[PDB]
Amino acid sequence: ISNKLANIPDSYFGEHGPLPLINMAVGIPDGPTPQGIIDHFQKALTIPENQKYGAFHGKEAFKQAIVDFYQRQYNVTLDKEDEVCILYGTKNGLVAVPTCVINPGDYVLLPDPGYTDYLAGVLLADGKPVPLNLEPPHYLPDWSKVDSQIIDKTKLIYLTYPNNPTGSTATKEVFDEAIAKFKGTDTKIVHDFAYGAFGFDAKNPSILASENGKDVAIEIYSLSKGYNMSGFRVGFAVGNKDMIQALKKYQTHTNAGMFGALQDAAIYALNHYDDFLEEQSNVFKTRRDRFEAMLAKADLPFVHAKGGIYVWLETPPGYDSEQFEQFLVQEKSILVAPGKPFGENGNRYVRISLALDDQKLDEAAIRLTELAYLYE
Template sequence: MPKPMNPAVRDIALSGIRKFFNLVQDKEDILSLTIGQPDFTVPDTVKHAVKEAVDLNKTTYTQNQGLYELREKTSAYINERYHANWTADHVLVTVGASQAIDIALRTLLVPGDEVILPSPIYPGYEPLVKLQGAHVVEIDTTESKFKLTPTQLEKAITDKTKVLILPYPSNPTGVTLTKEELADIKDVAKKYDLYIITDEIYSAISFDTPHVSMATFEDIKDQLIVINGLSKSHAMTGLRIGFLFGPKWLIPEFTKVLQYNVSCATSTSQYAALNAVTEAKDAPIQMCAEYLKRRDYVYHRLTKMGLDVVKPGGAFYFMFKLKDSRPSFEVALDLVNRANLALVPGSSFGQYGEGFLRLSFAYSMATLKEGLDRLESYLQHN
């Protein structure tokens, strides 16, 4: 018999989002509003940059930390939009934002540490925490309109707490935080010497007010890691480029973890990213305008159905409850079987997501209309 594998790997589960998506994918006439992938195409100048990189044989290893010019231009791009003060020495180029999160947690955590997550929350954080032998502490935000409050945070902190993960705009709720709300949370984290990892991958998709980055607060910079990338802003999900911003003293440590994992991010994708943050830097504006129309349409339809909905301030998701006492997985499956409509069960997003469903509006208006018609018909006959 082979020797046993790492039990931490055995104990983590596949993403509930993907599990449900795969479950319903082969069913006939299913309309799916499950996946958070932009339905736009990569900007033309970015496509050209990829082709040019291949034609010019820019297909070798880059610096482990990423192309210097990309780090320099990305810092300028982020600084301009979010009033930050990063330089090329503050950023690591990663294989998507997911790898950036993994690297940060692998560098910071030791067994027994605690990581605070505001729940409902994207399911990609908890497994990475557990792989380090650390523990997740979930905070229930369902009574505060999905917003983490400083009071909730302070009550959850123990002498083992090391990291707070703050993902706003949020997947799965679309909720975001104001500058004042961020400042209050920042003060608590600073008081207890916590690292803050802010996942700002949806920062370019902000609707009613501009996105506020935690990096605007200089007094937290030594404890702050900001995750960003181009998957959502530029519809570059398959090109896999993320950015990890952090204190200068930590970047070499993060780089070591990346070096022994992938050596460097894909060279051709890095040249594509360079174009995205320079020539195509305004591409998210048009996409965001279209998402806003969709957000308002879906909000109007859901509220007309009598559903209690928190209007998302960013990203492209709604999270809501049906008047149904069954577990969310059962409700989602019933929607598939009786309405041919797939939404993600809230149980995929932590224990406090139970009872909710998540709808993605990263789909065309025609698809959203048909999906909401099916939901409305289901509710009328349920």
């Protein structure tokens, strides 16, 4: 094995107690792909151009469905050539960014608590990952608290709103502040918008809808959660021309274009399923309302979720995230995601996925409320 790869901690998500298992460690809604997307994929398989190698950077109709989506969704004007890069699932693009953008020894700020997969990308590019310390209840950056020396050396920053695992959301103004802090520096921003569709009390803002957003940032959007297409492996990067062009160049070397039929299904999804995205957000909103109501009534301490598909729950005293994870699976047959892999600041929380039977979730709630005595 190479030294570079040896450095990389295993993908943390790469047995149960007596009770029937409830797996609340799941990303991703439980629902099927809308039938219309399925029907169009089925049809796209019979198309001669779809069976064969195509243009590396994607169909014109795909690039166009992307800019159209961003325009009517976020009033963001994008150029199809300069400001759009199709991704083979967003994980692939997110982990590619540092290789494309930074040089050995460059500092990269990573949200703590934040998403697990970024670290690998930084390490694959010989960068130096440094935590962006986010604090409850709202987990927003505090740029004045980042060491002045680190800010100066930072060439890339990941942001994630809605945040995985904390469910925290951003506003136009918090993006304004980030952009103003780093415009005219060599620091760029990657905003991971995987949960863009899931905004409970307010539609989540794009970083690119903030004035000057494209000057500092790209935004990465996934079809996985919004459209129940997680297994399909399709997303896109949008924004800063320089960053987009570097990604595009990287993908001409590591890939030979996206499956044409997958592109057509993606086009169909983006063009026709705005209402469904709304439906998805609403379904998780109430799922959240019911689950957090159960928790609050039994005085279990949690951080209220503002978007995404999870609740960020405190561990009780005398349990860390991994001890509480093992407790819940052993005693309660509830699988949760421990806060630890999400960063140091996740040490005393667990992540709970609401992406299961609107049924199951109720039994899981009653199971958890029984543990109220642990929090005294």
